[PDB]
């Protein structure tokens, strides 16, 4: 055979990074949540970031809220623990 070509350029570009799908996901600050979204739903209350799920205030137990947990903490001499002789 018999045949020739020109042209080529250098070139010095860094590996590209791993392109991601999503743009920015916020994640919920609700006890036993593990959901995020798009934008994020901070309260002005607590100034914090939640789920549309868990926007409301009650909803995510805001702190601020003028309510308290209808459960104390558990205050009881345990039973049945300790060596037992025989
Ligand atoms: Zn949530
Ligand atoms: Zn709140």
Redesign the pocket.
Request: hydrophobic share 20%.
């Given at each position: 055979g018999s045949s020739g070509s020109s042209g080529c350029s250098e070139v010095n570009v860094v590996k590209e990074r791993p392109k991601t799908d999503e743009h920015k996901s916020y994640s919920?600050?609700?006890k036993?949540?593990?959901?995020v979204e798009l934008v994020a739903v901070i309260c002005p209350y607590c100034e914090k970031n939640?789920?549309?799920?868990?926007?409301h205030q009650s909803?995510?137990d805001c702190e601020k809220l003028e309510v308290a947990k209808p459960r104390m903490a558990a205050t009881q001499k345990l039973v049945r623990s300790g060596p037992s002789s025989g």
């Open positions: 919920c600050s609700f036993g949540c593990t959901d939640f789920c549309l799920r868990h926007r909803d995510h």
